[PDB]
Amino acid sequence: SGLFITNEGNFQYSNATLSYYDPATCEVENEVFYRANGFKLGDVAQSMVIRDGIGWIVVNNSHVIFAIDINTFKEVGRITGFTSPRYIHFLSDEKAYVTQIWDYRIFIINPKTYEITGYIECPDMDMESGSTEQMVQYGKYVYVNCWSYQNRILKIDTETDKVVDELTIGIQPTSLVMDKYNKMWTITDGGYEGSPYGYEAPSLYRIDAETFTVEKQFKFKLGDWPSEVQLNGTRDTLYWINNDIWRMPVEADRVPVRPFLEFRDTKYYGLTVNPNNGEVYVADAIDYQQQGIVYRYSPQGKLIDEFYVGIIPGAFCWKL
Ligand SMILES: [C-]#N
Ligand code: NA
Ligand code: NA
Numbered sequence: 001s002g003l004f005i006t007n008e009g010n011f012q013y014s015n016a017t018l019s020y021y022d023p024a025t026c027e028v029e030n031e032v033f034y035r036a037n038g039f040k041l042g043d044v045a046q047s048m049v050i051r052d053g054i055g056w057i058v059v060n061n062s063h064v065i066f067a068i069d070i071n072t073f074k075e076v077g078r079i080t081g082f083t084s085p086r087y088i089h090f091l092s093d094e095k096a097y098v099t100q101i102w103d104y105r106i107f108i109i110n111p112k113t114y115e116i117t118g119y120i121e122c123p124d125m126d127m128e129s130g131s132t133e134q135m136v137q138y139g140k141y142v143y144v145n146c147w148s149y150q151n152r153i154l155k156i157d158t159e160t161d162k163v164v165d166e167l168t169i170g171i172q173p174t175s176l177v178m179d180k181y182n183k184m185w186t187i188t189d190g191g192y193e194g195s196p197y198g199y200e201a202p203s204l205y206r207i208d209a210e211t212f213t214v215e216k217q218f219k220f221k222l223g224d225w226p227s228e229v230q231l232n233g234t235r236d237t238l239y240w241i242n243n244d245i246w247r248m249p250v251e252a253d254r255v256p257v258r259p260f261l262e263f264r265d266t267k268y269y270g271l272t273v274n275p276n277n278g279e280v281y282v283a284d285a286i287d288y289q290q291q292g293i294v295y296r297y298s299p300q301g302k303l304i305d306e307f308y309v310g311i312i313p314g315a316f317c318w319k320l
């Protein structure tokens, strides 16, 4: 297999980069999109998905998704015109959703023709403070967290491409996963000091997908800035960032007393679990200025390897 690491770079500086790591050789190649194509991705490489041999790289502040050949890293296509794209979720070969910040609409695209083919309007949301983020599928429904200056999960009917329900929670749910019991997990960041929207103790929520109801809420400390719920491949061990890297069984009624990886006065910023072998990768932004590092741990928190990537490594994509 292989591991892609997206590096956000510094917002408004256009130093986003792509890295590729071979776990069998413990070798990283940096700046791989430039190496293959002789131009740069742009500003804030946010997320990446692979479908049918094609890697889709969301470049948040370059209004673009690139489609790359996952072996040569060559650009094979692109889609432009996104307000500020976040995440891409495929419904079929000919339909995906692309979420957005600073927009009240989710973009619908045809990945086969490289086209925007529609919009989903979100209720009670404007361009000024709009935000849609990560997506999980539940039968014909997609659930989407509304992050920046928002406090909702939305439920979208993917047949009609319409928002059919919403749930209000604590401010700024950051991420979204679905465990093996069809329970969604989200973790809020709690906003920031000086925010026009608010600042509070963040929470981790377990939400039933069937009924769209909160089953558990674990409240953290004011000043915490949690993020990045992730699951293992079996979808029964939840991971997240809150200073440390934390994990717990998705069946837990209590939060852990010991983290998977202790805070070290750095900036743990991205997180993935190998879906096949359980190995945990942690992307550390360090101070958000210098070259970041990824840490590869065994399922027991033994460091297998670590390697320098680009600036502000934020997201991972497995090539299996
Ligand atoms: C600001 N994340
Ligand atoms: Na950048
Ligand atoms: Na933007």
Ligand code: NA
Binding pocket: 124, 125, 126, 127, 128, 129, 130, 131
């Ligand atoms: Na709004």
Ligand code: NA
Binding pocket: 086, 099, 100, 101, 102, 130, 131, 132, 133, 147, 148
């Ligand atoms: Na967003």
Ligand code: NA
Binding pocket: 189, 190, 191, 192, 200, 202, 223, 224, 225, 226
């Ligand atoms: Na906070």
